Amino acid sequence: AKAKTRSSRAGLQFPVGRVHRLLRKGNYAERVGAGAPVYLAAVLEYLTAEILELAGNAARDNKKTRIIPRHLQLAVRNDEELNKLLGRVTIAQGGVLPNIQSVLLPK
Amino acid sequence: RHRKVLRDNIQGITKPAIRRLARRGGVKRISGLIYEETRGVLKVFLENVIRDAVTYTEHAKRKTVTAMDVVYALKRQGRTLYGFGG
Amino acid sequence: PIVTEQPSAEIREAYIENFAKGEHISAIVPGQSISGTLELSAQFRVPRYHSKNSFQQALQMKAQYYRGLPLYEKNTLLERLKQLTPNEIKELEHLHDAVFVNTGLQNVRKVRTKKWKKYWQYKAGIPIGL
Amino acid sequence: YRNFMVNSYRLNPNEYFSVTTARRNVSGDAAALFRLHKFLTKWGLINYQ
Amino acid sequence: TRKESYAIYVYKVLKQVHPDTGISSKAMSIMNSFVNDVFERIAGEASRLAHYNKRSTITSREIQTAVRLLLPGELAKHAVSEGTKAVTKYTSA
Amino acid sequence: TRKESYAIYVYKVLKQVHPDTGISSKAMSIMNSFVNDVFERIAGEASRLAHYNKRSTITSREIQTAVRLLLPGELAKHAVSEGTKAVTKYTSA
Amino acid sequence: RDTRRKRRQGRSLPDIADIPRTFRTPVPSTLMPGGVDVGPSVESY
Amino acid sequence: RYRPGTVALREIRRYQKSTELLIRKLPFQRLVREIAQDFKTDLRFQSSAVMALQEASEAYLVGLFEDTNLCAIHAKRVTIMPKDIQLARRIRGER
DNA sequence: AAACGCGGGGGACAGCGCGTACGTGCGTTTAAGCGGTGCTAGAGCTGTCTACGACCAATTGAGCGGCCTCGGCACCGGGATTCTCCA
DNA sequence: TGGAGAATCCCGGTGCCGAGGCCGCTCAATTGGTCGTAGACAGCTCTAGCACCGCTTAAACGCACGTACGCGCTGTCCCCCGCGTTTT
């Protein structure tokens, strides 16, 4: 019947039947066990909350209510486990964290 | 009724083993600061594989270790090695 | 062989000389004590007077001292254990375990008092046993 | 508590019988044991030599 | 031409998480890329496990195994629980 | 159980190529470890390309691109030849 | 990061499982069991 | 007797003239049971999984000692110091 | 083997020298980039289309597991060789 | 620049287990028919990359130079390994 999206059944924003549709689409298995899309959309919303947390943190730390990729750089690259997990992910218009080498500092 | 659990054979891996491998790795005067500076860092290598590899075992519903999941983990880490099937 | 401190009288001082700074050291140092381990449950257990199925089959059919107990004669105890019921076997097991643990605590308590009486003399300048 | 502190000082009078060992060896709140130890060392009787 | 994206969904988790902070569409695009990025990462890892043990029913047990494997530290154990959490909300519903 | 072993075909290539020299089964196990490993490297790359073309077909052009992007120098170009040429032999037979 | 997820599902407390042990740094006390024997000696020299 | 220093390099010949590992093996198998039994016990330990990692260890370590002396001789030393190793592992991305 | 030592002499290290280099400042443009055109190109969108291997039926020998060697190379005895350290 | 000696390389005798093939016996790999459908491929459109110059002007560049640091040179001491040890 209607598109009554399966995220509301899971308390989610990410429609778990779009996720089940994508898992049937992604050739991961023949049967897509119907909790695997909920596991996916659930880890998805957990990490969406994880990063939107630090994103709004760094954005209002720069006194802006608009979260920008520079804020994404300064929030993500300050993290141990995130930047340890994302050592090879680059953020365009993220730039650098402000930091100088220690002996290049004049005395 | 005997519990066989081992711990830190990395000193049973001798410091003469470092005086071997440092020459195999091209070191002349291995200072005393080096020999155990080695023995920690490789142990960082050691658990991290099996931390995933034991993770292979239980979803596989097993109580043994194969080199199959060693290969799963090493290739999973980008440590591709031949001699083992594939 | 009556204490369990660090017997080297130069590592205990170097431990405090760095402890006031707030630094660890190489060797270890425990607090002083006496030796001896009070190891229970690797010792006398609750005995197994029941069989592997002597309770569920009883459920279907609707049923001088060695350590702390004196050794009974062969004929007198046999008619006594021809009297009891498997409602009281679980009582008897725990009664005999309560005797065994009490004796195994009494003798170790006596040895422990004999050790502490020599600890307090040693830590007060008396040599021993005076 | 008082007999414990006085008996424990007089085994080795060259040692300052601290509050922390008295707190670690008898069961009670630290405030009352601290006040009793400071009263006791106020009148001699412990840590006098 | 309504084409399913995650811009209003990242907006949903935004106003679920930082309603005090609006977004740039650049950060929105970074996250919309990131969604399908790890959606492919973990599920290709899961198909890798589904070929490790030659399985054709990837359930949330298998995504649990992938979350166990790939993610470092709490990122595993949280996505262990959180990935179970709405699973327990959907296996109920 | 007929398990598709790669001792004999690689050894056919050895008796074609360095036939004076045998091969240890440790080395033959290196080859047998090489075979499906390499058979799936470019295969996963190529299915990624098959969705870069968004195609449910894969032709030898797709393997040609898998050769084209990736392999260093003439190892590409000979396999640009060879990968096509035996294709040119298979389109001849 | 545990508390980072208490807020997400809480939008929609002491740990009684971690029972700590009691190790104590030894007081510098001569007579008392549990303390190191630094400082003034038992003999008066 | 002799001086400090001389007989290293033929070792650097011979070890790299040869193909083997340079490590104790009963500590190797006991270390494998050691580390794999720490995560989940009761593993019945095939020696395949035991020996399957030693090439992945020792050769990379050997490669690390070359980078160690690379930073040591770039800083102009052969008494190699862990400053060289950790600057290498920094530029290796390990450190 | 490990393992424990142990001269022992030069390698690390400090440290001093020296001199130049590399920024720094500022003069000098200058091409950077911006607008601003003019346009058109292939991207893009549709528009049908058929062929293509799918898929599955039949088959069949492939090829490889289990079954037969015997020999390439390791092991070792002995000697020749060849690098190194003190004359 | 040279011999003594310790390590190495090389060469002769042994033998073996692994490399390779042998012997079925499938089973997978093929051929044989679809099968619409996938992408094959025609048309359409429109756009979106296209250079281009007007022009600025500050960035780049042009150069004076000043000294800092990087190395020039040393002595050391140290320190780590080598020779000898055995046990583990």
From Swiss-Prot, chain C:
Q: Which domain of life is it from?
A: Eukaryota
Q: Where in or outside the cell?
A: Nucleus
| Note in the entry | Present with 3180 molecules/cell in log phase SD medium.
How does it associate, per the subunit comment?
A: Interacts with SWI3 and SNF12. Component of the SWI/SNF global transcription activator complex. The 1.14 MDa SWI/SNF complex is composed of 11 different subunits: one copy each of SWI1, SNF2/SWI2, SNF5, SNF12/SWP73, ARP7/SWP61, ARP9/SWP59; two copies each of SWI3, SNF6, SNF11, SWP82; and three copies of TAF14/SWP29.
Q: Tell me, what does this protein do in biology?
A: Involved in transcriptional activation. Component of the SWI/SNF complex, an ATP-dependent chromatin remodeling complex, which is required for the positive and negative regulation of gene expression of a large number of genes. It changes chromatin structure by altering DNA-histone contacts within a nucleosome, leading eventually to a change in nucleosome position, thus facilitating or repressing binding of gene-specific transcription factors.
Q: Which family does it belong to?
A: Belongs to the RSC7/SWP82 family. SWP82 subfamily.
Q: What is this protein called?
A: SWI/SNF global transcription activator complex subunit SWP82
From what organism does this protein derive? Saccharomyces cerevisiae (strain ATCC 204508 / S288c) (Baker's yeast)
Lineage of origin:
Eukaryota, Fungi, Dikarya, Ascomycota, Saccharomycotina
Coverage of the whole protein, first to last residue? 275 to 507 of 623
Swiss-Prot record, chains E, F:
Q: How is it modified after translation?
A: Monoubiquitination of Lys-89 by BRE1 gives a specific tag for epigenetic transcriptional activation and is also prerequisite for histone H3 'Lys-4' and 'Lys-79' methylation.
Q: Where would I find glycosylation on this chain? A: 81
* Gene Ontology CC: one annotated term: nucleosome
Tell me if Transcription is a UniProt keyword of this record: no
MF terms (GO), sorted A to Z: DNA binding; protein heterodimerization activity; structural constituent of chromatin
Ribonucleoprotein among keywords = no
Q: Where in the cell is it found?
A: Nucleus; Chromosome
- What keywords sit in the KW lines? Acetylation, Chromosome, DNA-binding, Glycoprotein, Isopeptide bond, Nucleosome core, Nucleus, Phosphoprotein, Ubl conjugation
Cross-link Glycyl lysine isopeptide (Lys-Gly) (interchain with G-Cter in ubiquitin) maps to which residues of the chain? 89
Q: Which residues form a coiled coil?
A: none
Subunit and partners: The nucleosome is a histone octamer containing two molecules each of H2A, H2B, H3 and H4 assembled in one H3-H4 heterotetramer and two H2A-H2B heterodimers. The octamer wraps approximately 147 bp of DNA.
Q: Which family does it belong to?
A: Belongs to the histone H2B family.
The function of this protein is:
Core component of nucleosome. Nucleosomes wrap and compact DNA into chromatin, limiting DNA accessibility to the cellular machineries which require DNA as a template. Histones thereby play a central role in transcription regulation, DNA repair, DNA replication and chromosomal stability. DNA accessibility is regulated via a complex set of post-translational modifications of histones, also called histone code, and nucleosome remodeling.
Q: What is this protein called?
A: Histone H2B 1.1
Query: Which species is listed as the source?
Result: Xenopus laevis (African clawed frog)
Query: Which residues of the full-length protein are shown here?
Result: 33 to 125 of 126
Curated annotation (Swiss-Prot), chain G:
Locations listed in the record: Nucleus
The residue ranges flagged as biased composition, category Basic residues, are: 4-12
Going by the entry's taxonomy, the superkingdom of the source organism is recorded as: Eukaryota
Residues crossing the lipid bilayer are none
Similarity comment: Belongs to the SNF5 family.
UniProt function note: Involved in transcriptional activation. Component of the SWI/SNF complex, an ATP-dependent chromatin-remodeling complex, which is required for the positive and negative regulation of gene expression of a large number of genes. It changes chromatin structure by altering DNA-histone contacts within a nucleosome, leading eventually to a change in nucleosome position, thus facilitating or repressing binding of gene-specific transcription factors.
Q: What else is known?
A: Present with 217 molecules/cell in log phase SD medium.
Please give the subunit comment from the record.
Answer: Component of the SWI/SNF global transcription activator complex. The 1.14 MDa SWI/SNF complex is composed of 11 different subunits: one copy each of SWI1, SNF2/SWI2, SNF5, SNF12/SWP73, ARP7/SWP61, ARP9/SWP59; two copies each of SWI3, SNF6, SNF11, SWP82; and three copies of TAF14/SWP29.
The protein's name: SWI/SNF chromatin-remodeling complex subunit SNF5
Which start and end residues of the full protein are shown?
Answer: 669 to 752 of 905
Swiss-Prot record, chain H:
Keyword annotations for this protein, in alphabetical order, are: Acetylation, ADP-ribosylation, Chromosome, Citrullination, DNA-binding, Hydroxylation, Lipoprotein, Methylation, Nucleosome core, Nucleus, Palmitate, Phosphoprotein, Ubl conjugation
Question: By what name is this protein known?
Answer: Histone H3.2
Family in the record: Belongs to the histone H3 family.
- Sites where N6-glutaryllysine occurs are at 17, 40, 76, 83
Q: Which residues carry this modification: N6-acetyllysine?
A: 17, 40, 76, 83
Give residue numbers for the modification (N6-lactoyllysine): 17, 40
Q: How is it modified after translation?
A: Acetylation is generally linked to gene activation. Acetylation at Lys-83 (H3K122ac) by EP300/p300 plays a central role in chromatin structure: localizes at the surface of the histone octamer and stimulates transcription, possibly by promoting nucleosome instability.
Q: Kindly list the residues that the UniProt entry marks as S-palmitoyl cysteine lipid attachment points.
A: 71
**List of residues that carry Phosphotyrosine:** 2
This chain's source organism reads Xenopus laevis
Q: Where on the chain is Phosphoserine found, per UniProt?
A: 18, 47
Superkingdom of the organism of origin: Eukaryota
Q: How does it assemble?
A: The nucleosome is a histone octamer containing two molecules each of H2A, H2B, H3 and H4 assembled in one H3-H4 heterotetramer and two H2A-H2B heterodimers. The octamer wraps approximately 147 bp of DNA.
Positions of post-translational N6-(2-hydroxyisobutyryl)lysine modification: 17, 25, 40, 83
